[PDB]
Amino acid sequence: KLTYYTPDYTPKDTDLLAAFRFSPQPGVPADEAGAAIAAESSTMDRYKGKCYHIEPVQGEENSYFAFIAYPLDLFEEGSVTNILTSIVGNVFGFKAIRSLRLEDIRFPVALVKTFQGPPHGIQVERDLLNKYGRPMLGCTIKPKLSAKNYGRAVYECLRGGLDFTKDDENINSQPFQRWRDRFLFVADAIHKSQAETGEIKGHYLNVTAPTCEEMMKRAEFAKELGMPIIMHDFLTAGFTANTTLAKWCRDNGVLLHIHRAMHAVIDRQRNHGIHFRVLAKCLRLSGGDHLHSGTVVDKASTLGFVDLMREDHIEADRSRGVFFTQDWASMPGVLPVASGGIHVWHMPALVEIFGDDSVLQFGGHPWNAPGATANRVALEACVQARNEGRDLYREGGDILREAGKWSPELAAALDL
Amino acid sequence: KLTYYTPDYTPKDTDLLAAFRFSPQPGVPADEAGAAIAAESSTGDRYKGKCYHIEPVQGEENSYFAFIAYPLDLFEEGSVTNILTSIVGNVFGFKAIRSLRLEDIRFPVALVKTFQGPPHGIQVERDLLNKYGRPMLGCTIKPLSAKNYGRAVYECLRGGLDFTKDDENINSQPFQRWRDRFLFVADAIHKSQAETGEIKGHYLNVTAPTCEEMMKRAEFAKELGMPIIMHDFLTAGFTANTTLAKWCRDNGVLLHIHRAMHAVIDRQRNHGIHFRVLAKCLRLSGGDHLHSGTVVDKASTLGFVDLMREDHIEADRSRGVFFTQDWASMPGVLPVASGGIHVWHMPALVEIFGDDSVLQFGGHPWGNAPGATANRVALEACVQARNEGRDLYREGGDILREAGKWSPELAAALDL
Amino acid sequence: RIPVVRLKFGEVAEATSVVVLPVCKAEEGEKKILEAPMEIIAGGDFKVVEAEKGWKRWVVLPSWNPVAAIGKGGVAVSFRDDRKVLPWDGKEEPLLVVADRVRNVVEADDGYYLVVAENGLKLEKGSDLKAREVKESLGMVVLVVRPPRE
Amino acid sequence: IPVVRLKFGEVAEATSVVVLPVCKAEEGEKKILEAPMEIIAGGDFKVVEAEKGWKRWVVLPSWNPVAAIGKGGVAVSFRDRKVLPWDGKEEPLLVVADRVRNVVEADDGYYLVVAENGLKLEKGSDLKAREVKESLGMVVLVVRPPRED
Numbered sequence A: 001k002l003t004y005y006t007p008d009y010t011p012k013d014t015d016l017l018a019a020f021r022f023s024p025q026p027g028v029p030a031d032e033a034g035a036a037i038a039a040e041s042s043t044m045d046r047y048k049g050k051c052y053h054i055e056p057v058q059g060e061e062n063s064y065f066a067f068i069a070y071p072l073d074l075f076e077e078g079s080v081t082n083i084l085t086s087i088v089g090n091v092f093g094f095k096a097i098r099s100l101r102l103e104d105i106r107f108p109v110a111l112v113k114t115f116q117g118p119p120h121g122i123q124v125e126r127d128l129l130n131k132y133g134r135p136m137l138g139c140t141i142k143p144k145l146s147a148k149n150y151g152r153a154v155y156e157c158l159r160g161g162l163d164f165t166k167d168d169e170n171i172n173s174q175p176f177q178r179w180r181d182r183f184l185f186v187a188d189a190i191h192k193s194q195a196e197t198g199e200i201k202g203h204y205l206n207v208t209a210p211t212c213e214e215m216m217k218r219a220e221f222a223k224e225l226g227m228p229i230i231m232h233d234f235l236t237a238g239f240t241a242n243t244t245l246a247k248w249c250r251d252n253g254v255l256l257h258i259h260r261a262m263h264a265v266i267d268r269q270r271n272h273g274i275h276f277r278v279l280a281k282c283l284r285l286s287g288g289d290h291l292h293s294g295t296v297v298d299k300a301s302t303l304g305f306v307d308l309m310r311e312d313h314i315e316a317d318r319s320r321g322v323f324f325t326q327d328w329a330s331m332p333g334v335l336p337v338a339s340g341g342i343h344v345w346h347m348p349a350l351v352e353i354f355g356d357d358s359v360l361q362f363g364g365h366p367w368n369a370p371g372a373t374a375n376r377v378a379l380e381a382c383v384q385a386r387n388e389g390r391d392l393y394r395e396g397g398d399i400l401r402e403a404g405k406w407s408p409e410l411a412a413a414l415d416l
Numbered sequence B: 001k002l003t004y005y006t007p008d009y010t011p012k013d014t015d016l017l018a019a020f021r022f023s024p025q026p027g028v029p030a031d032e033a034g035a036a037i038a039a040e041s042s043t044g045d046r047y048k049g050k051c052y053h054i055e056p057v058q059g060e061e062n063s064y065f066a067f068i069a070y071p072l073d074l075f076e077e078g079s080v081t082n083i084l085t086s087i088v089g090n091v092f093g094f095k096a097i098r099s100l101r102l103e104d105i106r107f108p109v110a111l112v113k114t115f116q117g118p119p120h121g122i123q124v125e126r127d128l129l130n131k132y133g134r135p136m137l138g139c140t141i142k143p144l145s146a147k148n149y150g151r152a153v154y155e156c157l158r159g160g161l162d163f164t165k166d167d168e169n170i171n172s173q174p175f176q177r178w179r180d181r182f183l184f185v186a187d188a189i190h191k192s193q194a195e196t197g198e199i200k201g202h203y204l205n206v207t208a209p210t211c212e213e214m215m216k217r218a219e220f221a222k223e224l225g226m227p228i229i230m231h232d233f234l235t236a237g238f239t240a241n242t243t244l245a246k247w248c249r250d251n252g253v254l255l256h257i258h259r260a261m262h263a264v265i266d267r268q269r270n271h272g273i274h275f276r277v278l279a280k281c282l283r284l285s286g287g288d289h290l291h292s293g294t295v296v297d298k299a300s301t302l303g304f305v306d307l308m309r310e311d312h313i314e315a316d317r318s319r320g321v322f323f324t325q326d327w328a329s330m331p332g333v334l335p336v337a338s339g340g341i342h343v344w345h346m347p348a349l350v351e352i353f354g355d356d357s358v359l360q361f362g363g364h365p366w367g368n369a370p371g372a373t374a375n376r377v378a379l380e381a382c383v384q385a386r387n388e389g390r391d392l393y394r395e396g397g398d399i400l401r402e403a404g405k406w407s408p409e410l411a412a413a414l415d416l
Numbered sequence C: 001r002i003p004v005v006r007l008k009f010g011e012v013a014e015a016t017s018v019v020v021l022p023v024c025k026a027e028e029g030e031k032k033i034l035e036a037p038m039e040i041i042a043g044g045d046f047k048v049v050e051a052e053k054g055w056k057r058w059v060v061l062p063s064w065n066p067v068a069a070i071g072k073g074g075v076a077v078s079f080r081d082d083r084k085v086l087p088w089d090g091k092e093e094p095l096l097v098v099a100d101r102v103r104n105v106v107e108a109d110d111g112y113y114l115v116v117a118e119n120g121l122k123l124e125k126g127s128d129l130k131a132r133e134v135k136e137s138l139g140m141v142v143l144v145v146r147p148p149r150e
Numbered sequence D: 001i002p003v004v005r006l007k008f009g010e011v012a013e014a015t016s017v018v019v020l021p022v023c024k025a026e027e028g029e030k031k032i033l034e035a036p037m038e039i040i041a042g043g044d045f046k047v048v049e050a051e052k053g054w055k056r057w058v059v060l061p062s063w064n065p066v067a068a069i070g071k072g073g074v075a076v077s078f079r080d081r082k083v084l085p086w087d088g089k090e091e092p093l094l095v096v097a098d099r100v101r102n103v104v105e106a107d108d109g110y111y112l113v114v115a116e117n118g119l120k121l122e123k124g125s126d127l128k129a130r131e132v133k134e135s136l137g138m139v140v141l142v143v144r145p146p147r148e149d
Helices: A030-040 A080-088 A122-129 A147-159 A179-197 A212-224 A239-252 A263-267 A276-286 A299-310 A344-354 A369-388 A396-403 A408-414 B030-040 B080-088 B121-129 B146-158 B178-196 B211-223 B238-251 B262-266 B275-285 B298-307 B343-353 B368-387 B396-403 B408-414 C030-035 C065-070 C126-131 D029-034 D064-069 D124-129
Strands: A016-024 A050-056 A064-070 A097-106 A136-140 A164-166 A202-206 A229-233 A255-259 A290-292 A335-339 A359-362 B016-024 B050-056 B064-070 B097-106 B136-140 B163-165 B201-205 B228-232 B254-258 B289-291 B334-338 B358-361 C004-006 C018-025 C040-042 C049-051 C058-062 C074-079 C095-100 C112-116 C121-125 C139-146 D019-024 D039-041 D048-050 D057-059 D073-078 D093-098 D110-114 D119-123 D137-139
Touching: A016 A030, A016 A080, A030 A050, A030 A064, A030 A097, A080 A097, A080 A239, A080 A276, A097 A276, A136 A369, A147 A164, A147 A179, A147 A369, A164 A359, A179 A202, A179 A212, A212 A229, A212 A239, A212 B238, A229 A239, A239 A255, A239 A276, A239 B211, A239 B238, A263 A276, A263 B262, A276 A299, A299 A335, A335 A344, A344 A359, A344 A369, A344 A396, A344 A408, A359 A369, A369 A396, A369 A408, A396 A408, B016 B030, B030 B050, B030 B064, B030 B097, B080 B097, B080 B238, B080 B275, B097 B275, B136 B368, B146 B163, B146 B178, B146 B368, B163 B358, B178 B201, B178 B211, B211 B228, B211 B238, B228 B238, B238 B254, B238 B275, B262 B275, B275 B289, B275 B298, B298 B343, B334 B343, B343 B358, B343 B368, B343 B396, B343 B408, B358 B368, B368 B396, B368 B408, B396 B408, C018 C030, C018 C065, C018 D057, C058 D048, C065 C095, C065 C139, C074 C139, C112 C126, C121 C126, D019 D029, D019 D039, D019 D048, D064 D093, D110 D124, D119 D124
Parallel strands: A136 A164, A136 A359, A164 A202, A202 A229, A229 A255, A255 A290, A290 A335, A335 A359, B136 B163, B136 B358, B163 B201, B201 B228, B228 B254, B254 B289, B289 B334, B334 B358, C004 C139, C018 C074, D019 D073
Antiparallel strands: A016 A064, A016 A097, A050 A064, B016 B064, B016 B097, B050 B064, C018 C058, C040 C049, C074 C095, C095 C139, C112 C121, C112 C139, D019 D057, D039 D048, D073 D093, D093 D137, D110 D119, D110 D137
C-alpha cells in the first residue's frame, strides 16, 4: 500500500493524471483507499501508478479525492479504448470502497499528439459551412411517418431558416422506414432548400449501425448524396466504432455530430461512475466536430466543459470542475450543442452563456417554417443586441418583445 | 399519463418487455413515474410503450418496479445498439425520478431470431476443442519482452491449462507491440500442442482503437492458427463487438468476451443497468465465452448464468429473473468464473457452475508448470468425485486432500 | 376527518419553535407505544429536556399548534404505507401519526383513535368504536404528518 | 451568538427537524468528544438517524445559527451559584456548540473549554492569550427558559 501512496511525488510533464472521488468502507483509511485505487488501475517499478495527493471533500464526511499519476508508457498511442480500460476497467468494482467516481483526467501533450482529434474542428467547420458571427440553429423533426413525408418536413424547416435538422436518435432503420429511403428523401429536401435559399443546409443523418460495415455503407451513401454532416452515438456504438467513423470523416470531408445518448447511465449519480467532462475530453481526442453538452436553461460544471472542449489551454480551477491544467497542443476544439427544454424565450441566455461557437437544437410552433422563422429572428436579434452592448440576462425580455414586432412568427411564439 | 399507464393490458407474444426499478422524487406518485418511463423510452398509437404493471419493492421505502411493453417495430432487426438507445438512451436522465435501474428485458422470439447469436456456442465449442466431461481451466500471466511472455505461455499451457489469457490492459504499448506478442504466443501454443497432444490456446487481445486495426489483429491471429481471440465489449462498443462476432463465425475463431468497465454501470443497486441485461444483450450480439465472475449474491448470479446458457428459463423473482425467456434454440455462452479463486474453491466452483464453464485463475511455490498441474489435478478430482455422488460442498476438503497424496504439485498448493 | 399537516422541503430555514416526540413503528406494535415515555420533563431554557424513560428513536417536529398542545402523552407512529391506516385515499407514502394517549377514551364520534387491528395498527373513527363498544384506545390521533415533497 | 427564549412562532419563516446530542457540564470534555456528530434526517419517515446512540436528546428549533451547524452539533447543560438562597437562582443553561469549529479563530466568538470543575465558555481572544488555539466547541447561541410573562 505504501508502495503506491507516495505523498512526496511531483508529476512529470508526460504523466497522465487522474482525479477520483471516493467513499471508503468504514474501517478503511483514506490513504489506504487511495493507494488501492492506484494499485488496481496499474501493475517493473515504472509501470505502476502513484497516488500523490489525498484530500477530503469539503463539507462531506467519508468523501475524499485522490490524485493518481500514470506513466505515459502504459497507454497505446491514439487509443481511447486503451486509456479507458486502464483507468476505469476494474477500480469501480473494488471492495474497500463503497463508491467511486472519476472526476478528471490530464492528458499529457505527449499523448494528445498521438490522436487525430476532431475531423475538422471549429474554425474549419465554420469555413466549410460559411457561417460566421453567430451560433447555429436547428431542431429535431416531429413526429419522431413515410420517407416522403419526412423529407417534406425537413425541407420546410430548413427552407424556413434553420441551419440544421436532426434525425431522431432512436431511428436507424425500421420496418416502417428504411434508412436508404430516408437518406434519399432527406437529401432531396436539402438540395431543394439550398438551391432556393442560397445558403448551406444540412441534416444530421443517423449512421449508427449494428456493424462496422453497415456503418460505413450508411456513411458512404450520405457522402454520395452530398451530405455535409452525419450523426453517431459514441457511447452506445462505442469508441472503436466512433474513432473509425471519425477517421473516415476526415478522409472524406464530412462533418461528424456526436449524440450523447446513454450518458445518464454512466454519470447521473454524483457519487459513482464517470463524470461527463471526462467523456467529453475522451471524445475530443477520438473525433467529432459537434457534441451535445446540453443546456442549463450545474452551471459551473457546464461552463467547465465548454472551455475544456473548445480552448487551447484551460487553467485548473476547482470551482468550475477543472482539476488539472490542460494543454491541448493546438488540437482543434469541438463545437458544443445546447439542447433540452429550449425555445425562443431562452434565446438571450443561450447566446450569452455559450457565445458564438455553439449550436442550439430546439424542440411546436402554433403556425414548421414559422418555427424556423421565429428562432432565426430571435437569434439574430440576440446576437446583434449582444454586440451593441445590451445585457442579454436582463434586457432579453425586451429584445425578444421588440423582435416579436418585426416578424409575427416570433410574436406567435412569444405569445405562448 | 393516461395514454401510457394502462393497468389492464396483456402483453403480446411479440412485445419486448422491460422491468425497471425506481425511486420517484418526493411527492411524485409511483404511477405517474411509471407512465413517464414508458413515455420517455418510446414515442412521447402503435409506436408507444405501455406501462402495464407497477408494484412496490418489498421491504424498500419509496422504491417501485415498473413493467413496460414495447412493440416489435420499434427495434432494428439484428441490432443491440438500436435496442439500447431506444430503451436506455435518455430515460435515466428523467427529472421526476431520483434514480432508475434496469433489471431485465424479455426479448420476443420474433426479435431473437434476427440476431446471429454466439459464433459457435457451447456444444460446437466442445466439439471444436474436443473437450468433454469437465469445466475448462486457464489463468492470467501475472507479469516482459514478447519472447519472455511466450515462454510463460508455453510453460502454463504445457503444464496442463487449457487456456492462457492476455492481461486485459495490454493491447499494444511501447514496451511490447502486439505483432510480436502474437508471434511468440502462437509459437508457445504450437509447441505445447505438439508435446501434449491436446488442444491449447490463448486469449489474444484484439481490442483495438479502430475497426480496421481490430480486423488486422484478428486476421493475423487467424493466419497463425489461433483457435480463440479476446475482446472487451463494453469499452470497445457493441458495433465493434458485433462486427467481430460475424468475422469469427466466418473464420472459425472462438470469441472470448471480457467484461471490463461493467462496474461503472452496474455496481450500485439503485441506478444503472443490471449485468444480466448486458449478458442477454451480449448473447444476441456474439461471443462464445463471457465472464460472470465468482461467487466464492449467488442467487442473482446463478439467475443470469442460466439466462445465458439455457434454452428456456421460467420467470423466478427469487433469482432475479423477471420474465420468462424463450431463446428459440439460439446457442448459449460459457460463463467464466474468475477473481479471488484458487484450488481451495475448486469443489465449490465445479458444483456451482457444472460442466459448461471455464475457471480462470490468477503464485504457485514451484513456478508455472506446477501451478497448472495443481489446478488440473484439483479439477479432475472434483469432477470425478461429483460423478460418484460425493458432496463437494462438504467433502471438498477431503477430495482435495486425498488428491494431494498423489500429486506433489497440488500438495504444494494445499500447503498454503 | 383527520387533521393532516404535511412536512415540506426547505422548512429548515427558520423554525422558531420545535417539539420532540418518541417514535414507535407499525412493526414495533402496540407494546412499543405503551413503552414510550409519556412525560417529557421540560426544564428547558431554549429546549433542554429529559425523559422519564430512555428511548431509542426520536422525531423532531415543528411546534405546529396541535402538536404543541399535547405536551405529555405525545407519541409518533411510523407507518410504511398510508393507505392501510388511512380510512380514505392514500399517496403510497410513509405516514407519521401523532397520538395523544391522554384522550384515548373514545368520546369524540368524529375523532380518530389509534387501535390495535388484527393486521397491525389502524386509525378508527370514534363512532365506529362506539358501535363495537370499545371504550378505550391506544391513543387519540391529533395530527397526521406527510413527508417533504420536491 | 443570539440568546433566545424558547418562544413559539416569533418569526414566521418555517417549521422543521433539527437535533443535537446533550451533554452535562459536569461530564466534561469526554462526553463532548463522544457525542454523535452526524444527525441525518431522511427516508420519508424523517425519524432522525445518528451514527451512534446517545442518552439525552434535545433539539434546538431551526434558528439560523442552529441550522448553520450541521455536523458537530452539541448541546451543553449548565447549572448554577447563588451566594444567598433568597436571592433568585440563575436559570439552568444549555450551550449549542459547533464541535466542527473546534479551532479558535474569532476573538469575539466564545468557545467551549474545560473549567477546573465542569466546562466553561471563554472568549476567543482570552483563549489565544492563554495560547490555546483549540477548543471543544464554538458557541453559536445562548439560552433563556420559556417565559410566558
